Amino acid sequence: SKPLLPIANPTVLRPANTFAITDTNDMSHSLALSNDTNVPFVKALDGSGLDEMSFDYLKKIPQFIQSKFFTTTTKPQEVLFQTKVMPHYFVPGGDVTVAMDKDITRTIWQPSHLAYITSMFKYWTGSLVYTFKFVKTDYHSGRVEVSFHPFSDYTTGTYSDYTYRIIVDLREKSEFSVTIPFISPVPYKRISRPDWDKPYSKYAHASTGTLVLKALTSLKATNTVVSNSVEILIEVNAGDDFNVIAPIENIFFPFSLSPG
Amino acid sequence: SKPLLPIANPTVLRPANTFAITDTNDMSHSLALSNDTNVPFVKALDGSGLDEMS
Amino acid sequence: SKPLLPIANPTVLRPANTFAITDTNDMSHSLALSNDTNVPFVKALDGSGLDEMSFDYLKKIPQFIQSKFFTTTTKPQEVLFQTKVMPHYFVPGGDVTVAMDKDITRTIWQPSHLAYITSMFKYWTGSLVYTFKFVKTDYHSGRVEVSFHPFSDYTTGTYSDYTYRIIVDLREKSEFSVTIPFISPVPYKRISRPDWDKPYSKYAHASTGTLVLKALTSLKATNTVVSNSVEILIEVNAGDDFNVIAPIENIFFPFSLSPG
Amino acid sequence: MAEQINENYENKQQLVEQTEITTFENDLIVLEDGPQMEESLPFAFHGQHTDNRQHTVVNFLQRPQVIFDSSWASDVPRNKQFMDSIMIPDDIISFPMFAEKLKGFSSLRATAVITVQFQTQPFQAGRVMLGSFPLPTLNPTRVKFATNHVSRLMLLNHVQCDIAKETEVSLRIPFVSPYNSYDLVSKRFPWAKVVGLVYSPLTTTIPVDFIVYGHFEDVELGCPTSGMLAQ
Amino acid sequence: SNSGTEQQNPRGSSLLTDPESITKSDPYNPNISLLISGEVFTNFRNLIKRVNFRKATTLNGKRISDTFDINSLIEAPRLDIAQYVDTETKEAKYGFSYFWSAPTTLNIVAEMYALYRGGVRVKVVTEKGVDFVRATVSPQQTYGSDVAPTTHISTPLAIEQIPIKGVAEFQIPYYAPCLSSSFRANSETFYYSSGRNNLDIATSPPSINRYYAVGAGDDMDFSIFIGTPPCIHASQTAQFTKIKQGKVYDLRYDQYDPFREVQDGTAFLNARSIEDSDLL
Amino acid sequence: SNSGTEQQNPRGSSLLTDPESITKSDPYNPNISLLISGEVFTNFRNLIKRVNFRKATTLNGKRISDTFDINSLIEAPRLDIAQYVDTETKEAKYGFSYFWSAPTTLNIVAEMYALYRGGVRVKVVTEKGVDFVRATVSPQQTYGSDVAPTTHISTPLAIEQIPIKGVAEFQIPYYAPCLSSSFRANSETFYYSSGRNNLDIATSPPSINRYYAVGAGDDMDFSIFIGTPPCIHASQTAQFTKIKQGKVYDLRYDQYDPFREVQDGTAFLNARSIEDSDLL
């Protein structure tokens, strides 16, 4: 035959498909035996059907973020623990501390599990789950008050009776874990460099509010059989609606180590 | 398999789609997580269903 | 008519289709009378419907790899033959031995049938079939033990009673052929340069284990009518599940000869 | 098939008797004799030497085996070990009950179960963490950074114990490897390294004692082998 | 309830169910990521498809080849300690450095897992005047031979033409004996769990600078969660201490990305990669 | 059973059925090539489609043409013996060499078979400044004439434009009188079994270096298995003996592949192709 052909649609040509995009198509060459040679997805390699790669699995893993004490010298209404409500923290003592010279040592503060996982994004949302462990016996005793102040600080003139709180009687009880909801004027808050020693009024863009663990009582204990100190162990979990968007940031660069 | 292919229609290539036009298509790269990532239209942001842009 | 046209999808252009791929399409020009001019496939050119090009046909062809002897001086439990379980070997005396000068001669060890066919790939799997010929009469006699040690060597402290073995009574019988299965911790083992004189503990990446042909008995024979030596002739065949993957290697370069 | 017309040699397909593993294939004649009309004594007459049960080689692996039996005082603080590290399954299958049974097997694919006991009179406090780093010989770069600190171990697969609440604790570690099984003849590719840290120190002088048990479930034993390597 | 004697939120329980809300009501808000972001993020398996620049080859000559291991790209690059000496006052200042390297989107995810499975995608950017770029994989080790060939006759070849396609995109499959392979360094030598592969990028005419960007192929999958890697603060890139001959950036980095400015930090004097035994 | 008096595993029986397992049970494991490799290999008919570089034309001048036989490309190239003389001590060292040639994926398969049938695919890479490349086939022999024409008026022509497509891909059909043709050299002269064809690659402007890569066309088929060819170890490419003026590689090779490094081996002094009569 061999007849002519009508003109086609005007095209526009690129050097590469868009690096930025997750989907659509890729122009690479296949160095395999055939094109679109792919390895089938095999699940439960880790022994469980939980997709260990899923964000909704990783985010739900508890992690210790700070320790406090609760003693027989604690006054009532004394704050034991006070944090901005935010997913990203620093690891307490798990710093990377390398020697530079015979006597110069430097310390890199290391990221929370949530801090690392949200490190590449820009905004977050959803409820968080704060767990409190009390390493004690059935023969210590104490009331703590976990009150969630959604928009404000805990300062002078801050009555905790306005806020969803839980007054837990720690006689036999030993642990405590609440889901702190996402209450904010913004559908998303900012991921940031974590700062323990900041109020909420600063970092107002990265936190929803402040949560406070407050003593209602001194720690009751007979000194001849049990101790006077009891360590508060705080963990952070990331709820179920915890959603994270806008992947145009980096707060933490990872590196690998060299074998020694 | 790998057989030959017939010749295609003659094309004509541009540096850009026409700036002037409202519609049709745009050749840009998406800097989002995925291509054709778009925000849904939400109406009555101004408190009324009147399209304040119309 | 002649109206305008909408813009097309953004394309990306290459100098050539991917050399590496077996399938998909090729951009070449046809120097024939018409495009996609192809010669129809005609089978049984070789007189048989077996696709002489199929890997699953080529792999199933027996080939002699080493000779041993079995005499009236052989002690019981003496190893006659010991090999790593692997498809690729060297041809015994079929070396390429060319003269370089009036008195310089060099020898190229030549590849097994399986060695050559798997030479372009990287990993193999599947069962192998080792054949043992005993060039004797009905008036020789002997027991041999063919025991497959899947993960280990044959050394001191190696009892062959732990392993699938065959104690064959060679009075009238003369031949012997077993399918040695693929037992390994890896779904595939490595194709390599073959080495007879290596144990399994070295080449642990290329072999499944060691197979051993061991005498259970001296060779019984009256010296006035038959001989004292009987030659063991070993062949190697490559099973039916023998699968070979990852075509990114070359161990053997072929060449053609010049007419003399 | 190459066709073969044989009339001088019988296809002696009998005289071929496999006995579990070993196959005899014989010429001439096979003979077998003994006392004829064999009976057995009923079970009341003997059987004072056995239990009313049978033990395979899969149990003997499902049996708990004591690995550790020790203590730790109040001098060890958070993020420091209270028990020695355990390689799975090297520090388990090296005990004679298991090793005598795994011998003669190529490999092992099973989930391992590490159980730990804890002794407490009700006046003692503290918490303790038991985690497992997968495949420590394949990623040695990352082992000691994921196990020198609590809150990098507990996001791994871990199990905690409140000293004044839990008297037993058991972590289930499923088999996981780039491979199918665990090479027994060469002991290559252990699939976890159990480490034990202190989540919070003791509050009294009285140390705490602990027993570490280890067994396997979901057991798939490999091919029979001699299991000896050169050296 | 929210408190009690049993462990109120163990790991195995956190993966499945959340504790009661402080409100003793429904604490959950509906997902509206698609309504504000315009896109939804749920799995890191998709996010690793994003290609970012990973390494650069500068310190060789005008060569026609560049061979290097593939699994090393799934690792995050080594962090190095940089010794700086003041050309005037001769006292030492000390910082951190990525030697002609940087991590990728891929490397942020891969460092949380133990094994990998699937193909790696490599895209190259070259200097001007380069006409072609060719990619080939080879096994790095002819097993049982002290030396590996310098050519191959049945390996994959893939040619991209720069002046008509400026980025040379290649996809390197998964070729390893095992189900899922390993990508970090180890001292295992008996038999191997990694698929050890080379990748040779050629340029016609021969050139000096090769810029490599890496990303996840479609079939990319990681296996066992192990934990968060050792990290460095991103803000440490802009912090610097001034000395006589110039600036000393806490996190020093090279022109690994052919599109980033060259930071005005003076060259160091010695480099030492942080070993696992250096951690205190 | 596994043993007996009849031949337990002849050829004709090995092609169809395997002997009993040593386990006296099922010895077979299931095919999982698609599950690990991501692809399945079963037939060499598909593998020959892979194109690798085969020869190079350097030792002519700045010409506008390069004519050569097509069936010679299905052969593996001749292996040559190289005489090296030490510029100092004047003793001879001896190695092997591929004179501006190398085998292809295609050549590994074609050397196991006797006859071929189908079209050959030839792809060319040229030097800079070349604008066009043209391909034409011609019969090499005007039968019955002592000379062949220098032009033709009804032959195939195929033009590729380099600066917009850098690799000039051509496909040469199967034109021979017989069902399946022969591709190796013979002394047959009565009538012929090979389809003797030339192939003329032109360059505008005329150039010197022509790099050719060959592969199997879709209709490629080989006929009669004959056996494994004479081979050379691939590891012999990196082994060398040092002399005064440089290195002497056991397997010496040229820049046949315009993307491979030039190996640092000194030129030889004499070349001799291994004849079939040289084998001992």
Summarize the structure.
Chain B: This is Structural polyprotein. The structure is cut from a larger assembly and holds three copies of chain A, one copy of chain D (231 residues) and two copies of chain E (280 residues). Chain A is built from two helices and 15 strands.
Count up the domains of chain D.
Answer: 1
Largest sheet of chain E: 4 strands, antiparallel
CATH class of chain D: Mainly Beta
Shape of chain E: globular
CATH topology of chain D: Jelly Rolls
Radius of gyration of chain D: 26 Å
PDB class: virus
Keywords: virus, Apis mellifera, honey bee, honeybee, Picornavirales, Dicistroviridae, Cripavirus, virion, capsid
Entry title: Structure of black queen cell virus
Chains A, B, C: VP3
Can you put this structure into words, describing what you see?
Chain A is mainly beta and 260 residues long. Chain A has a single domain, classed as Jelly Rolls (Sandwich), CATH 2.60.120. Chain A is 3% helix and 28% strand. Chain A has two helices and 15 strands. Chain A has helices at residues 55-58, 113-117, and strands at residues 29-30, 63-70, 79-84, 96-99, 105-108, 123-125, 128-134, 143-149, 165-169, 175-180, 189-190, 210-215, 230-237, 243-245, 252-254. Chain D has helices spanning 90-93, 96-102, 143-147; strands spanning 16-19, 22-25, 65-72, 81-88, 107-118, 127-133, 157-162, 168-173, 182-183, 192-200, 208-221. Chain D is mainly beta and 231 residues long. Chain E has 280 residues and is mainly beta. Chain E contains four helices and 19 strands. Chain E has helices at residues 11-14, 33-36, 44-47, 105-110, and strands at 3-4, 52-57, 67-69, 80-85, 92-98, 115-117, 120-126, 132-138, 158-161, 168-172, 181-182, 198-204, 210-216, 221-222, 231-233, 240-243, 246-249, 251-253, 270-273. In chain E, strand 16 and strand 17 (246-249) form a beta hairpin. Chain E is globular. Chain E starts with a strand and ends in a 7-residue tail after the last strand. Classes of the chains: A mainly beta (260), D mainly beta (231), E mainly beta (280). Chains A and E meet through strand 1, helix 1, strand 4, strand 5 and strand 9 of A and strand 1, helix 3, strand 5, helix 4 and strand 8 of E. Chain D: One of its GO terms (molecular function) is structural molecule activity. Chain D: It is found in: Virion. Chain D: It comes from Black queen cell virus. Chain D: One of its GO terms (cellular component) is viral capsid. Chain D: Residues 74-203 form the Picornavirus capsid domain.
